[PDB]
Amino acid sequence: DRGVQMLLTTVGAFAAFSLMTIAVGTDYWLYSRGVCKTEEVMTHSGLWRTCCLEGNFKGLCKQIDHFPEDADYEADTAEYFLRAVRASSIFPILSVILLFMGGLCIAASEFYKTRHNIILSAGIFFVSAGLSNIIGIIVYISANAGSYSYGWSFYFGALSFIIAEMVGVLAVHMFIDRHKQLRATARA
Amino acid sequence: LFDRGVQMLLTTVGAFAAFSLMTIAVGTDYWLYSRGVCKEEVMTHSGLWRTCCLEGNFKGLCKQIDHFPEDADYEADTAEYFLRAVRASSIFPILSVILLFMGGLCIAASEFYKTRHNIILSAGIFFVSAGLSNIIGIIVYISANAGSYSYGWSFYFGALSFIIAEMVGVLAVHMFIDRHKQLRATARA
Amino acid sequence: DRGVQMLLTTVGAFAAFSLMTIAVGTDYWLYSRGVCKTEEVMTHSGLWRTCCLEGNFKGLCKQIDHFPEDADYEADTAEYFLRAVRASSIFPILSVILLFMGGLCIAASEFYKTRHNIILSAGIFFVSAGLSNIIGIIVYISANAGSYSYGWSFYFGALSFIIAEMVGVLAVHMFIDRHKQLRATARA
Amino acid sequence: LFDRGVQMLLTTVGAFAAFSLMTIAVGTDYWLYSRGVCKEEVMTHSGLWRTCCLEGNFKGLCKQIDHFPEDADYEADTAEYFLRAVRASSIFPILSVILLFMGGLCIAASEFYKTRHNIILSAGIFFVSAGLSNIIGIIVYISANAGSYSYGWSFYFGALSFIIAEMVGVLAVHMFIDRHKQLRATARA
Amino acid sequence: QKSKPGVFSFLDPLAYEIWMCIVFAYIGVSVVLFLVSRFSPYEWSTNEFGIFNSLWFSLGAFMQQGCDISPRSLSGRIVGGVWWFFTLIIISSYTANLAAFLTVERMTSALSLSNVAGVFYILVGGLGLAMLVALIEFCYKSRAEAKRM
Amino acid sequence: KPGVFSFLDPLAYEIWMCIVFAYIGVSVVLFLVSRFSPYEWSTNEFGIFNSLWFSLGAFMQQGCDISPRSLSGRIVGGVWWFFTLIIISSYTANLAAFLTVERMVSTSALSLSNVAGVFYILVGGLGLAMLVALIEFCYKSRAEAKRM
Amino acid sequence: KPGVFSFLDPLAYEIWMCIVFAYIGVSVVLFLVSRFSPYEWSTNEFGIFNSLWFSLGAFMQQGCDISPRSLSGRIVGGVWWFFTLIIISSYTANLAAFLTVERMVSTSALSLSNVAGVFYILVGGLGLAMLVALIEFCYKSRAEAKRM
Amino acid sequence: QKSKPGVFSFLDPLAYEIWMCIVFAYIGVSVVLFLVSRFSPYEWSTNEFGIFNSLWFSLGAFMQQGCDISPRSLSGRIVGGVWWFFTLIIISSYTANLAAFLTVERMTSALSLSNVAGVFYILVGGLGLAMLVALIEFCYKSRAEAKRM
């Protein structure tokens, strides 16, 4: 049913957008040890700040410094470029923006039924959001590399990518069905 | 492979042979020929529950297998404990025996009320699931063993049961195909 | 043309048979330092006898002992079986016999034109002769394993296998050609 | 890719550019940027025939490359001597230049007596062979060198010449295909 | 002392992050291939690259098991080529790291059944899941046919 | 003095036996999930003979003429592909470890004695195939005479 | 800190450059010997675009939709297959040597930092493919809209 | 001291006897496959396994490059299966021995062009040979065609 497809597409788009927005903003990206006030204590860290867990300074969040200029070392330019990419979180934010644009396209598609290219634009935006999510995950893990566990905030982004890809698949199906019906009418 | 009466007899005798082989395998203490104590390390032949001494000073003395030994077992992860429990219970070989028995029951009940074609399909499905469970049981048993040795005839009796069950299971589904082919043939004409 | 096919098949069968028979009986299978009748000097070794080269006892051949029972050792029975296979040279001789049988079948096929199974039998014999040549080569090299170079006798058998395989291809091609001609007659 | 007049101009300019780039690559001493003695050790830029000084005490002093050095060369097997002989002569770059020139001349002569379609095909094989010769020359040069460094613009001038020569070789056969397509199309009418 | 290898120890050569990213890349490649293969109405379907078929193609490409179908468009071929390069690199890295692990011991005999009992378990589980899915399909088709009649 | 069948050294005997059993099980399951349903009658060329061929081709990582198209058949194929990939990579890695460790123990190339077993198996398979083809031809020829 | 493109480490940069040139030359020669002869007109779908696809698939050792049928095209394919087999085996063996020698130097698993570059290349290729598909769609739509 | 590797040093991991027997095994398998595929008149062809196609299939099987055709009879499939097992074992052995060579030095850096220059030479020689064969075929057809007219 095309109505069921519409409902599933919009519900999944909103769910993926909400999950990924929570993932970007929240702080349960990674459980790791370290001082939360700049002693070794378990902490939970996100994309911007890390806060103490089960410690004397529990609850005190501290901004994450992505440029370790204590030794004033640069090494190669690739490391600096990766540091700049990770610090801005440009790819998770771009995934959020593209998911929002896909949702906007889906919402605006009902206003103009004749223009089928809006559904295609929504599908392209969703798939690009998934690709940006993949790039962001890769960049985040690579930056972390240079005992630990991943929290629900990180797994929220992982599940958000899957939902966005599934919604993009459904959106392209709607674009395919709309053009097939248009061709079917012309033959009749 | 041809006709229907000869296929039925071959499938029935194959199912019974597989059932007998697995019944012997699950109930015979000849699964592994390894050095061990059956009460100093000595040549013993082991099985699923008891191991008896071989060419020893007290031959033919069987003792239960220490599946959960005491005296500083050192413990292990939950996966190892689960594997040990599965091996001790022998759940997969026993489930294989059960599935062979119910497949044979379905085959026997197929003659009565021959209009029910789903009974033979059920027998084939049960035989295939029994073969899969036999694979799981053999894997679990060998993995627990590796936690100079040679395997006895009962272990190879169990090995033949899996082959026969899948062979018999193949034949049963062929009957289901041929029976439905006949239905399509008589429906068109 | 069928006549050219027959001529090529006969010429190749005779060439392969003669080359392989020369290989079996000659002594230039392998160049290796060794001893004649009992100093390590360069020798050329065949399949039954090893003869010294450019030494004090030059020109003298000595029979090869394929059972080194000096220390009275057997180890595994697989080694004994391999040595027995090497000592008897069962596979090179079998290749010779199969090549001879294929040649005889080819010669007798001209007597009975209707009986096309003789051509197929000749092709099967040639293919089996090539396979036996391969087994013999493998066994010979493996037995040698348990500085050296290979002589023209060994490479005579190697090229005999290639020709016999080529002749076997032509023999089968002739068999199908005759059967296709028979089917054409039935259609007409 | 479209029409014939634009195709002719594109093929001609590509062939001429490839020929110019390969001539520059052969005749310029900027192939490898490695430290070496161009007369102590100093930074030098080398080519196919002569290695020359850079930023040294006597800048611009250009000296011939020692392809078969004296003073206990230690010799080698036949393969290494053969490779050194090829590297010294640089025949494969020269063969590439010759084949590029032959292909360009064939392309130029294709306009004269346009009924001769095989001229464009001849140019196609000439350009493809010139690209293959460029590949062989590059491989031989690198293997001879390897037996910190960086490659100069003339080495990458020659690399572009091979790459261009293959599309120009690709275009020529497309023209040969289209010319035979035209013959078939008018033959039907 | 050397520990008894885990049931799922065949995943040891690669980190869990690599496996997770492999799954994500597989899903993304399948979706992109499906979209670039079938979105355009001017290509309608000339190819057979549905979402299920795209997933099958990507799975076959990763396991180096050939393909029943091959992309024919420029974009689909770009997708296939980058996925093939990725698969080559990843499989080679897995093999190389497994060889390194089996060569050097940190704190050589034949691989035992305990080293691959995991992959055997996933195989048997997949067989059972496939059988269950086929049985569900048969049961659904049987009930619907009687409903129609 | 390597054994004739020393190319099976990297994996244990139980692994090879379980490989044969798993191949048989996968082939049987593929046959069932391909042909058991009369509602699909068929649209796939996956018989018991063809299922074994597909499974063998997948284990050897060689080109397959056909692939399963249904969901269950594709699940079987996917799990078999994962199993095959892991097993082949494990064999190659363990062989590399064996050779590297032997190389560092206080000539270099592998000799024919290390693969003589695989050569013997190949030639035996060729002979068996020839025998099967000859038997099939003879049986058909006898049938042709009977019909005529 | 492994480099982003550290997966190319087992082979020298000259080897990669020569691999690119060899691929180009093999594809061009394939298109040559497949389509140059009007007497074969075609009976084979080996154009310039398809020859590049076949060469790429052969190098990646992945399933090929088509294979050359002529003697010269098959010679090209066979020599490319031999080259690809040797190159891929060399890559795997050198990577294994790198990892083993690093292991035996006085965590263990490969990290995402070791293979970040191949992931970046894959996502960039997906983006490029999408961009190309969108360009083609826009061109076709604008051409058809003006035509109608 | 470590000497410069030979041009054809990529054949080092396997002994020359192994390569010789590989060539003979390839020829024998091709011939046997052709024979079992086309000898029987009762199979007439249904399959495309001529001698040229059988050689192509065997070569593609050895190089792990798939196949455009597959044997369908029991005997042809037996031949294909044993050839596949042989190919898998041989390629794995080559890779393993090359890794062992590169790991342990007897009397690690990136592989240089000199290590694989021989395979490049063979590739270019094969390209030239194929080009020559194609040109010879075209020239022969050009002269033969004018003879008819």
Author numbering:
A (entry chain F), C (entry chain H): 5 to 42, 55 to 162, 173 to 214
B (entry chain E), D (entry chain G): 3 to 41, 55 to 162, 173 to 214
E (entry chain B), H (entry chain D): 508 to 551, 567 to 629, 784 to 825
F (entry chain A), G (entry chain C): 511 to 551, 567 to 631, 784 to 825
What sentences appear in the manuscript?
AMPA glutamate receptors (AMPARs) are ion channel tetramers that mediate the majority of fast excitatory synaptic transmission. They are composed of four subunits (GluA1–GluA4); the GluA2 subunit dominates AMPAR function throughout the forebrain.
We next determined cryo-EM structures of the GluA2–TARPγ2 receptor under two different pH conditions in an apo state (in the absence of l-glutamate). We chose pH 8.0 to ensure strict alkaline conditions for our structural studies and note that the GluA2–TARPγ2 kinetics at pH 8.0 matched that at pH 7.4, used in the functional studies above. We repeated these recordings in the presence of the AMPAR auxiliary subunit TARP-γ2 (transmembrane AMPAR regulatory protein γ2). With GluA2–TARPγ2, the accelerated desensitization entry and slowing of recovery under acidic conditions closely resembled the TARP-free recordings (~2-fold slowing from 15.6 ± 2.9 ms at pH 7.4 to 28.8 ± 3.6 ms at pH 5.5). Taken together, protonation induces multiple changes throughout the receptor assembly, including rupture of the NTD tier, rearrangements of the LBD pairs and rotational movements of the TARPs, culminating in reduced charge transfer through the receptor channel.
